[PDB]
Amino acid sequence: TLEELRAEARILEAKAEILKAKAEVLKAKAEILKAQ
Amino acid sequence: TLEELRAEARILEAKAEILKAKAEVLKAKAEILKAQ
Amino acid sequence: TLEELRAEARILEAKAEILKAKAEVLKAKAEILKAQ
Amino acid sequence: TLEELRAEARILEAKAEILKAKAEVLKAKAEILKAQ
Amino acid sequence: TLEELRAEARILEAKAEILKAKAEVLKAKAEILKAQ
Amino acid sequence: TLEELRAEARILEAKAEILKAKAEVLKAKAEILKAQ
Amino acid sequence: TLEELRAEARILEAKAEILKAKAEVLKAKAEILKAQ
Amino acid sequence: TLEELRAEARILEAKAEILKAKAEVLKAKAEILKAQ
Amino acid sequence: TLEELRAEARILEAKAEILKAKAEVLKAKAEILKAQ
Amino acid sequence: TLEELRAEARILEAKAEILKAKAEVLKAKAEILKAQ
Amino acid sequence: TLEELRAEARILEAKAEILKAKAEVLKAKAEILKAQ
Amino acid sequence: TLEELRAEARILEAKAEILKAKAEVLKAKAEILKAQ
Amino acid sequence: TLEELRAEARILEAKAEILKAKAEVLKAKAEILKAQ
Amino acid sequence: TLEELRAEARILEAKAEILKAKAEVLKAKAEILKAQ
Amino acid sequence: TLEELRAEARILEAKAEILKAKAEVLKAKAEILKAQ
Amino acid sequence: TLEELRAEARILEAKAEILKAKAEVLKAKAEILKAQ
Amino acid sequence: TLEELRAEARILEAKAEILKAKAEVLKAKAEILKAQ
Amino acid sequence: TLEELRAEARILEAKAEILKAKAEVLKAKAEILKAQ
Amino acid sequence: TLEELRAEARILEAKAEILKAKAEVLKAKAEILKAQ
Amino acid sequence: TLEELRAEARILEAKAEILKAKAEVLKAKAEILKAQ
Amino acid sequence: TLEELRAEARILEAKAEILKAKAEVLKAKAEILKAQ
Amino acid sequence: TLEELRAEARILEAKAEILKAKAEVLKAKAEILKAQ
Amino acid sequence: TLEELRAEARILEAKAEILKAKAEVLKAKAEILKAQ
Amino acid sequence: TLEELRAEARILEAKAEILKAKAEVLKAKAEILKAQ
Amino acid sequence: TLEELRAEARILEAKAEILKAKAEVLKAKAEILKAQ
Amino acid sequence: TLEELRAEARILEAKAEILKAKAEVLKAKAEILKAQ
Amino acid sequence: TLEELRAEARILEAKAEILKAKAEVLKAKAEILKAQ
Amino acid sequence: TLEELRAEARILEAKAEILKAKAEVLKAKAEILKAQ
Amino acid sequence: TLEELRAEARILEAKAEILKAKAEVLKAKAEILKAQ
Amino acid sequence: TLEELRAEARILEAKAEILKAKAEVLKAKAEILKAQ
Amino acid sequence: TLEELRAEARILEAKAEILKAKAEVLKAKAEILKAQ
Amino acid sequence: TLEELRAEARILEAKAEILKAKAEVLKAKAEILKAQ
Amino acid sequence: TLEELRAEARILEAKAEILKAKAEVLKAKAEILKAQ
Amino acid sequence: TLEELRAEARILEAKAEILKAKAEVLKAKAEILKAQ
Amino acid sequence: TLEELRAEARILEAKAEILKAKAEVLKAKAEILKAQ
Amino acid sequence: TLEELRAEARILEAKAEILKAKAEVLKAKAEILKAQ
Amino acid sequence: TLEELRAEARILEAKAEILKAKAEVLKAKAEILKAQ
Amino acid sequence: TLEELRAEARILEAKAEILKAKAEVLKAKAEILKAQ
Amino acid sequence: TLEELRAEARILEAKAEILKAKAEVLKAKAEILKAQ
Amino acid sequence: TLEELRAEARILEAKAEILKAKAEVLKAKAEILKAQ
Amino acid sequence: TLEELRAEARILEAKAEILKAKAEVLKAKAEILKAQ
């Protein structure tokens, strides 16, 4: 269970990181919208 | 129990971080809505 | 009991943080509702 | 008793913080209700 | 007795803070009831 | 006696503050009863 | 005696303040009884 | 004697204030008895 | 003597004020006795 | 003598005021005796 | 002499006022004797 | 399951990195739009 | 599946790197636009 | 499929490198534009 | 009986006050009849 | 009966206040009739 | 019935307040008629 | 009915406030008429 | 009906606020008329 | 209708704010007229 | 209509802000007139 | 119209900012006038 | 028009920044006038 | 016109930066005047 | 004109940088004046 | 003119760098003055 | 003139570098003064 | 003059390098002073 | 004529008030003549 | 004429107020003459 | 003439206020003469 | 003349304020003379 | 003369403020004399 | 004279501030005298 | 004289600040005396 | 004298800072006395 | 004297810093006393 | 004396730094006490 | 003495660094206690 | 003694470094505990 | 002793390095645990 919960931590750690780079697409998306 | 509660802390630590990047999707979502 | 109460502190520390990021979902939720 | 009362302080310190983030859920809950 | 009364102060300091956040639950509770 | 009376002041200072936040629970309790 | 009477003033100063917040519990107690 | 009488003034100044808040407990005590 | 009589004035000024708040305890004491 | 008589006026001014609040204790004393 | 007689007026002005509040002690003294 | 979840972590780790360099295309895209 | 998912990781690792050097073309593209 | 995906990795690895040296043409292109 | 007679006083106290404001309707009723 | 008579006092207290503001409509009604 | 009569008090309390501000419209209405 | 009458109180509370600011328009209306 | 009356409260709350700032235009309007 | 009335609240909320800053133009307008 | 009224809110939000900085020009305008 | 009103918001957002820095010229203008 | 208004935003964004550094010349101008 | 206005932005961006470093000469100019 | 204005930007970019290092001479000039 | 202004940029770029290393002589000059 | 100014740049480039190594003599000069 | 200034650059390039190795004598001089 | 007669009332209202404060100068004029 | 007579009222309103404070100088003038 | 008479009102408004604070100097002047 | 009389108002406004704080020196001057 | 009278206002504005803080020295001077 | 009077203002501005912090020494001086 | 008076301002500015931190020693001095 | 008074400012600037950190020793000194 | 007073400043600057880190020992000393 | 006082500064500079890292031992000491 | 005090500085400099790495053992010690 | 104290520095320098790498064993020890 | 302490330094220098490579075994140990 211990390493399993360590693994269940490990999969949920990854799911945040996709949403992090999802925001950074939207971050420079506005940077196009202001540099013009 | 001790390392188990340490693990039950560890899984609940991860569940916050998905909601953190969930907000940051919505953060730059408005930044598109103002840079236009 | 001491480290146990330290652990019972430690689990209750985590339960606040989910509610913190729960509010920040609702924080930028209104920010969509004003940037439009 | 001293560190025990220090620990009994420490558990009661945590119980306030859940109620703090409980209010902040309700804080941005009205912020949805005004940004619309 | 001195540090003991300092500790008996310290436990009674914590008991106020739960009631403080207890009110702030009720504070934003009415804020839902007016933002609608 | 001096620091002892200073400590006996210090414990009695705390006992007021619980009653202060006890009233503020009842303060916003009526605020629910009028915002509806 | 001087600082002692200053301290005997200081303890009796605290005893009023508990009764002050004791009244303010009863103050908003009637405010529930009229907001309904 | 001068600062002593100033101190004997200072202790007797405090004894009035407990009776002041003693009346204000009784003040809002009737306010419960009329708001019902 | 001058500042001494000024101080003997100052202590006798305080002794009236305890009797003032002594009456105001009795003032709202009858106010309980009529609001019922 | 002038400021001295001004001071002898000043101490005798205070002695009236204790008797003033002495009457007002007796004033509301009858007010208890009629509100019942 | 002029300001002196003004001061001798000023001390004799105070001596009336003690007798004024002396009567008002006796004024409410009968008011106890009739409210019963 | 453990190495499998380690592998399911490993594929989801890669999917973030494409979106990271996707933003950096848009990052220097605005840098053309300001250096002119 | 394991080495297959390792391979499906391996192809998706390459697709990021083309976009990385795609940005660096645009990086020095603005550097021409400022060195003049 | 495995060595095929290894080969499909291998062709896509090459396509990045042309764009890498494409940028380095533009890198020293500005270096002419500043050394003059 | 005592608090009951205090209550029977309390209801009869209210019945006067309706007649008081009943007269004050008629008071300004003539004030219309003279300001014209 | 006691709190009931307290409530029957409480409803009859309200009925006076409508008649109070009823007069004050008529109060400024004549004030229009004299300021012209 | 008790809280109901408390509520029937509470609705009749509101009906006075509209008439209060109704008079204050007429109050400053004459104040226009005299400041000219 | 209770919360309904609480709501019927709540709508009638609002209708006074428009008339309050209606008077304050007329309040400063005369203040123009006197500052000239 | 409840949230509807809460909404009918909510629209009537807004209509007062325009009249509030309508008065404050007239408030500083006289302040021009006196600072000259 | 509910979100529509929430929107009809939302447009009427904005119309007050223009009048607020309209007054503050007139506020510092007199401040020029007194600093000279 | 909803996002349209959200947009009609959004344009009227901007019109206040020009008047805000219009006042702050006049704010420091008097600050020149007093620092001399 | 939507992005157009978003653009009409966007131009009116800029017009405030010139007036903001217009005030800050006048802000340090008085700071010269006091540092001397 | 859209990118044109985006450009008309972009030129007006620059005009604020000259005035920003114009103030900061005046900011340290007083800092010379106080460090002496 | 678009890239031209982008260029007219680009020249006006540079003119601020000379004034920025102009202030920072004056910034450390006072720092000599206080370190002595 | 475009690359010319880009060049006229480019010469004015250089003139700021001499003044930047001009300040940093004065920056460490005071640092000698405080390390002694 | 273009490459000439590029050259006039290029000579003025060099003149800053002598002043940069001029400061760094003074930078370690104080470092002798503090390491002793 | 062009290559001449390129040469006049080239001689002034060298004069900075002597001062750079002049500082680095003083840099390790303090390093003797602290390693002892 | 051109190759002459190139030569006058070339002699001044050498004079820095003696001072560079002059510092490196002092560099390892402290390294003796710390390895002991 | 109506507002004119209202204005002719308004000027004649002011002429009384100067004579009112004219008497109050003479009122305290005798109060000097008796306090001496 | 109307606003002119309103202004001729307005100047004559001010002339009374100087005489009002003229009397109050004489009011406390006798209060010095009796407190001595 | 109108704003001139408004200004002639404005200067005569100021002349009263000096005499107002002139009396208040004399007001507390006697308060020194009685507190002694 | 208008702004001149506005300025002659402005200097005479200041002369009152020195006398205001002149009285408040004398105000707390007696407060020393009674607190002793 | 105008800015001169503005300056003669400005010096006389400062002379009041020294007397203001002169009183506040005497204000807390009595506060020492009563807290003992 | 103008900047001189500005300077004579500037020195007299400083003399108040020493007296301000002079009072605040005496402010917390009594705070020692009551916290004991 | 001008920079001299600026310097005489500058030395007198420093003398206040020692007294400011002198009070703050006494500020937390009582905070020890109450936390016990 | 000028740099000397600048130096006499500079030594008196340092003497405040020791007293600042002297208070902060006493600041956390009470923080030990409350965290127990 | 100048560099000497600069040195006497420099030694007194160091004496504050020991007391600064003396407080920070006591700062985290309480942090042990609350984390338990 | 100068370099000697510079050295006496230099030894006292070191004595603070041991106490700095002494606190940081205690800093992470509590961090063990909360991470469990 | 000078180099001796420089050496006595040098030994005391080393004693801090052992305590620095002593804390960093305890720093990652808690990092084990949270990563589990 | 000098080189001896330099040597006693040199041995104590080594004892820190073992504890540094002792922590870094524990540093990556937790990194195993999170990468799983 | 000197070379002996140099040797006792030299053996203790080696004991750190085994622990350094001991950590680096554990460093890449987790790198296996993440590359899968």
- What is the DSSP code string of AD5-31? HHHHHHHHHHHHHHHHHHHHHHHHHHH
For residue AH33, CA distances in Å to D7, F4, AG34, AH30, AI20 come to 36, 18, 10, 5, 19
- DSSP label of AM6: H
Q: In sequence order, which residues have a C-beta less than 8 Å from that of residue Q11 and are 6 or more positions away?
A: R5, R8, R9, R12
**Pair of tokens at residue AF23:** 């009285």
Q: CA C15, CA L13: separation in Å to the nearest integer?
A: 27
At position K31, the amino acid (one-letter code) is E
Would an 8 Å CB–CB cutoff place Y21 in contact with chain Z?
A: yes
Task: Say how far apart CA X8 and CA Y8 lie, in whole Å.
Answer: 11
Radius of gyration of chain N (CA): 16
Neighbours of M24 (CB within 10 A): 20
Residues from chain AD that touch AE35, judged by Cβ atoms under 8 A, are none
Q: What is the DSSP letter of Q36?
A: -
Alpha-carbon distances of AG36 from F5, G1, AC17, AG29, AI24, rounded to whole Å = 18, 13, 52, 12, 20
Sequence length of chain B is: 36
Subunits in contact with chain Y (3 or more CB pairs closer than 8 Å)? M, X, Z, AK
Which partners does chain H have (≥3 C-beta pairs < 8 Å)? Answer: G, I, P, AG
User: Cβ contacts (< 8 Å) between AL35 and chain C: which residues?
Assistant: 10
Q: In whole angstroms, what is the distance from residue AK3 CA to residue X35 CA?
A: 12
- Chain X residue closest in CA terms to AJ14: X35
Cβ of AD7 under 8 Å from any chain R Cβ? yes
Question: Residue AB19 and residue AB12: Cα distance in Å, rounded?
Answer: 12
Is residue AL29 within 8 Å of AM19, Cβ to Cβ? Answer: no
Q: Rounded to whole angstroms, how far apart are CA atoms L4 and A3?
A: 13
Q: Using a CB-CB distance cutoff of 8 angstroms, which residues of chain N are in contact with residue Z7? A: 36
Q: How many CA atoms lie within 13 A of G27 on its CB side?
A: 17
Q: Note whether I36 contacts O: Cβ–Cβ < 8 A.
A: yes
- Distances in Å between the Cα of AF3 and the Cα atoms of T26, U12, AE16, AF8, AG11 are 19, 38, 20, 8, 20
Q: What 3-state class would DSSP assign to M2?
A: helix
Give the distance from residue X19's alpha carbon to the nearest chain Y alpha carbon, in angstroms.
8
Spell out the alpha helix ranges (H) of chain AC: 2-35
- Give burial (CB, 10 Å; 0-12/13-18/19+) of AK11: middle
Contacts (Cβ under 8 Å, ≥6 apart) of AD5: AC7, AC8, AC10, AC11
Chain Y residues near residue X2 by CB distance under 8 angstroms: none
Residue AK12 and residue AJ18: Cβ atoms within 8 Å?
yes
Q: J19, I17 in Cβ contact below 8 A?
A: no
Nearest CA to B23 out of D30, E31, D28 is that of D28
The contacts found for AF14-19 with CB under 8 angstroms, 24 or more apart, are AF14/AG9, AF14/AG12, AF14/AG13, AF14/AG16, AF15/AE18, AF15/AG12, AF16/AE14, AF16/AE17, AF16/AE18, AF16/AE20, AF16/AE21, AF17/AE21, AF17/AG13, AF17/AG16, AF18/AG12, AF18/AG15, AF18/AG16, AF18/AG19, AF19/AE18, AF19/AE21, AF19/AE22, AF19/AE25
Instruction: Kindly tell me whether chain F and chain G come into contact, counting contact as 3+ Cβ pairs under 8 Å.
Output: yes
- Maximum alpha-carbon separation in chain Q: 54
Cα–Cα distance, B16 to AM35 (Å, whole number): 16
Nearest to AN32 by CA among AM31, S8, E28, AO27: AO27
Contact (CB<8Å) A13/B10: no
Q: What resolution does the deposited structure have, in angstroms?
A: 4.4
M near N: at least 3 beta-carbon pairs less than 8 Å apart: yes
| Alpha-carbon distance AK9 to nearest alpha carbon in chain AL (angstroms) | 10
Q: Which residue of Y has its CA nearest to Z27?
A: Y28
Residue AL4's CB is within 10 A of a number of other CB atoms, namely 13
**Cβ–Cβ contact AE4 with S under 8 A:** no
End-to-end CA distance of chain F: 54
H-only helix segments in chain AA: 2-35
CB AL23 within 8 A of CB AK27: yes
Residue tagged 């008579």 (tokens) = P5
- Interchain contact, H21 vs G26, CB within 8 Å: no
CA distance W16 to V14: 9
AE35 close contact with J: CB closer than 8 A: yes
* Largest pairwise CA distance in chain AK: 54
Is the Cβ pair R33, Q36 closer than 8 Å?
Answer: yes
Residue Z24 identity (one-letter amino acid): E
Cα angle V20-V22-V26, degrees, rounded to a multiple of 5: 115
Nearest-angstrom CA–CA distance, S19 and R22? 7
The C-alpha angle with vertex Z11 and arms to Z8 and Z14, in degrees rounded to 5, equals 145
Q: Tokens at residue S6, please?
A: 């809460």
AI2 close to AH11: Cβ distance less than 8 angstroms: no
Going by C-alpha positions, the residue among AC35, AF32, AF33, AG28 that lies closest to residue AE34 is AF33
Angle of helix U2-35 versus helix AG2-35 axis, rounded to 10:
100
Of AE2, AE8, AE31, the CB nearest to AD4: AE2
Answer for the pair L35, M34: CB distance below 8 angstroms, yes or no. Answer: yes
Look at residue B36 and give its three-state secondary structure: coil
CA distances from X5 to V10, W13, W19, X12, X15 (A): 17, 12, 19, 10, 15
| Shortest distance, CA AL36 to any CA of chain AK (angstroms) | 10
How does AG8-34 read in b/e, with b if 16+ C-beta sit within 10 Å?
bbbbebbbbbbbbbbbbbbbbbbbbbb
The angle formed by the CA atoms of residues AI20, AI25 and AI28, to the nearest 5 degrees, is: 120
Task: Look up tokens 């330099």; give the residue.
Answer: AN6
Q: CB distance from AJ22 to chain AI under 8 Å?
A: yes
Cβ contact AF3–T36 (<8 Å)? yes
> Which secondary structure element, helix H or strand E, spans residue W33, and what is its range?
helix W2-35
Residue F1, judged by CB atoms within 10 A of its CB (0-12, 13-18, 19+), counts as exposed
Q: How far is residue AO33's CA from residue B27's CA, in Å, rounded to a whole number? A: 34
Whether the CB-CB separation of AD36 and K7 falls below 8 Å is answered with: yes
Residues of chain T with C-beta less than 8 angstroms from the C-beta of D34: 10
Q: Would you call V3 an interface residue with chain B, using a CB distance cutoff of 8 Å?
A: yes
Q: AE21 at the AD interface (CB within 8 A)?
A: no
Amino acid at AE22: K
For M26, which residue in chain L has the nearest alpha carbon? L28
- Chains with at least 3 CB pairs less than 8 angstroms from chain W: A, V, X, AI
* Start-end of H helices in G1-36: 2-35
Instruction: Determine contact, residues D11/C3, Cβ cutoff 8 Å.
Output: no
Structure tokens at J12: 């005798």
| Number of neighbours of residue X1 by Cβ within 10 angstroms | 8
Contact AJ32, AK33 (CB under 8 A): yes
Q: Give me the residue label for tokens 């001796």.
A: AM4
Query: What residue segments make up the domains of chain AE, in order of their start?
Result: 1-36
What is the full DSSP assignment across Z1-36? -HHHHHHHHHHHHHHHHHHHHHHHHHHHHHHHHHH-
Dist. CA AK22–CA AK19, nearest whole Å: 5
Tokens representing W31? 């800092």
Cα separation, AO36 vs AO30, in Å, equals 10
Q: Do chains AG and U touch (3 or more CB pairs under 8 A)?
A: yes
- Find the discontinuities in chain W where C to next N exceeds 2.5 angstroms and give the residue preceding each: none
Which of AE1, AE5, AE6 has the most S C-beta neighbours within 10 Å, making it the best mutation to test the interface with S? AE6
Tell me the C-alpha to C-alpha distance, in Å, between residue N29 and each of Z5, Z14, AD11: 18, 21, 81
CB-based contact I3 AF36, cutoff 8 Å? yes
Q: DSSP labels for F10-31?
A: HHHHHHHHHHHHHHHHHHHHHH
The CA distance from AM36 to B9, in Å, is: 9
| Nearest partner of J31 among K30, H31, K32, judged by Cα | K32
Q: Which residues of X touch AJ3 (CB under 8 A)?
A: 36
Q: Which two tokens stand for residue AG22?
A: 């002169």
Q: Are Z23 and AA26 in contact (CB under 8 A)?
A: no
What is the distance between the terminal CA atoms of chain O, rounded to a whole angstrom?
54
Phi, psi of AM33 (to 5 degrees): -80, 0
- Which pair of structure tokens corresponds to residue Q11? 């609705």
φ/ψ of N19, rounded to 5, equals -70, -25
Residue E29 contacts AJ where some CB pair is shorter than 8 Å: no
Residue AA1 neighbours by CB under 8 Å, 6+ apart: none
Chain AE residues close to S33, C-beta within 8 Å: 6
Q: Other C-beta atoms within 10 Å of N2: how many?
A: 11
| D22 interfaces chain C, CB cutoff of 8 Å | yes
With 0-12 / 13-18 / 19 or more C-beta atoms within 10 angstroms meaning exposed / middle / buried, residue F15 is middle
CA distance AI9 to AI1: 12
Residues M14 and N12: beta-carbon distance below 8 Å: yes
For residue AH5, count other CB atoms closer than 10 A to its CB. 14
Per-residue DSSP letter, K1: -
Which site among D11, D19, D33 would you substitute to test the C interface, given the most C Cβ atoms closer than 10 Å to its Cβ? D11
For residues U29 and V26, give the distance between their C-alpha atoms in angstroms, rounded to a whole number: 7
Residue AM12 identity (one-letter amino acid): L
Residue type at R36 in one-letter notation: Q
Query: Half-sphere exposure of residue X22, counting CA atoms within 13 Å on the CB side?
Result: 17
d(CA S24, CA S17): 11
What whole-number distance in Å separates Cα of residue N21 and Cα of residue AM11? 54
Residues of chain F contacting E19 with CB distance shorter than 8 Å: 18, 21-22, 24-25
CB U17 within 8 A of CB V14: no
CA distance H26 to chain G (A): 8
Q: Do chains AO and AC touch (3 or more CB pairs under 8 A)?
A: no
The angle subtended at Cα AI11 by Cα AI5 and Cα AI14, nearest 5°, is 140
